[PDB]
């Protein structure tokens, strides 16, 4: 589809059998979950922001379908207070900015 | 333009006769720059983001040319990692998200 950004680009994503809200985050080298347990193993690690730093839990090869279209690759899980999906998994769908 | 995701969306722009290397932002509400003294009057405020919130000098109607189009808006100016242009100024260029 084609997202005007008049509010936050949020959309409906899909992790398992989980219906979740993500924004569309250009601004986002990763993507950064709110906190969830995902099966397997994880590596802490430290990504900054407008603000500072925040500790995260992540994972990889993660299957993540954003409005229909389906992505794999890291995924963080921090308590951010809202879902972003970043340009690794942007890319991945054939996302881009026109204008 | 068409703007791929596979490195950071970096753009120049030219504000208060300068050019800056900024980033298109859809994950942002507000317009944030580096610190650089601007004409006119600016008010304190406060923005958030990961890590926490900064403080930043709020000026307004502020003139920046982006990829050759004109905007006319808000800009905050504070110790930001990185030159952001957000949702705010990116609407007033026509920009969209399309995949
Ligand atoms: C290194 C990196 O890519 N960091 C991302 C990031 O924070 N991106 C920022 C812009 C940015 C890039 C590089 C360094 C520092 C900052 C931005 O795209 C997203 N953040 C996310 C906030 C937004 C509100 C919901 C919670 C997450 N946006 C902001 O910090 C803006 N705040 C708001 C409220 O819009 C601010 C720039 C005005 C994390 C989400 C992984």
């Known amino acids: 589809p084609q997202i005007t ?14 219906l979740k809200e993500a924004l569309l985050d250009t601004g986002a080298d990763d993507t950064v979950l709110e906190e969830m347990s995902l099966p397997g193993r994880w590596k802490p690690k430290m990504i ?3 603000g500072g730093f925040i500790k995260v839990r992540q994972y990889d090869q993660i299957l993540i379908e954003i409005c229909g279209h389906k ?11 809202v879902n972003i999906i970043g340009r690794n998994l ?10």
Do not use: H
């Open 5 to 18: 950004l008049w509010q936050r680009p949020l959309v409906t994503i899909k992790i398992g059998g989980q």
């Open 48 to 50: 900054g922001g407008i």
């Open 71 to 81: 992505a794999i690759g890291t995924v963080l899980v921090g308590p951010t207070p």
């Open 90 to 99: 942007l890319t991945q769908i054939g996302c881009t900015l026109n204008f």
